[PDB]
Design a protein around this ligand. Sequence first.
Ligand SMILES: NC(=O)c1cnccn1
Length: 378
Amino acid sequence: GPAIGIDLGTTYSCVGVFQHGKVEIIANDQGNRTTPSYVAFTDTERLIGDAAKNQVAMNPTNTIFDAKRLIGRKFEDATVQSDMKHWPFRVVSEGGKPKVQVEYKGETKTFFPEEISSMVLTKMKEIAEAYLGGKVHSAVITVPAYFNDSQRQATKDAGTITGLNVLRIINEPTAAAIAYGLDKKGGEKNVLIFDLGGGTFDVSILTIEDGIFEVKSTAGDTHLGGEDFDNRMVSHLAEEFKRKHKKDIGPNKRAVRRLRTACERAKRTLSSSTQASIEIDSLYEGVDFYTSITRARFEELNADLFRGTLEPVEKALRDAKLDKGQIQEIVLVGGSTRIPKIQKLLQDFFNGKELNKSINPDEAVAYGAAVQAAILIG
Ligand SMILES: NC(=O)c1cnccn1
């Protein structure tokens, strides 16, 4: 031991340990139970995790995130060429493989995606060592069900560079089903995993029988998540600010970014309260922006995006050749599945069926990976 599971996520990662028969999800040095998959290069140092995400606005060209969208792919791949148009950092080609290019200590450096992901995994490993004491040797690391062998191997390579024994690479939806004990809960079970993250949406249909998992279908949207909901709140409240103070913040990127920060936090509050307060000091020309937003307003601004999540569900069913009534278990994954309106649409779509949601959905994948690590060690 220790028995360690790592969710290596597109924008956030999570590490758990299995100890005394149960999973403990591990908070990092800032007390956060999830850690940004961010790596920043400055004039003097390499920052990882919270420290990297916290200076992203100040240093956007040298702060890497989304390395998971590059790992195991070729520079010429259509997704890479399309994704590159939206990143503030530079992506270059070496022997046909993508690399991020940054300034670090005054010089140009290039890193393979598995090198950036290794720096992330090193941070996750140190987070678990600060929690446990001593050293971590081994981990189960998770990947999307649609990852091919090149993406799986490059993820493993990130673990190898970090100096972890990678016990197994398992699918993220499988790890979530494991967290709920669905392989132990004697028949086949069709399980739908609905995984709605900060910037990705994955629907997976699995069958589970006598502890064997098979992926039947996958669907979703690789560029839809919680950040899209925040953006709807940003446009709404920027218009409100314009209406109340006759000041357009739109051309000012610091004012938009600060509004966005407030909206992200308001949105989190709205999954447990019916209202949230925005309290921005000196948003624009010394003018404060103090206001409040209701859950009903947030749901309205997002009507298309929330209802639209049911369309990959229907596609995954059609591809699996299943009627919705043939799903035995529905599993919520990703921070965005906390939104009550999303849970209601999904539940009504499944004719009132209860959702597996008792595990923090942003932790379920690391939770299942930690159970799997315990099994493999043992
Ligand atoms: N959503 C936005 O980024 C936004 C909206 N209105 C003005 C400026 N930015």
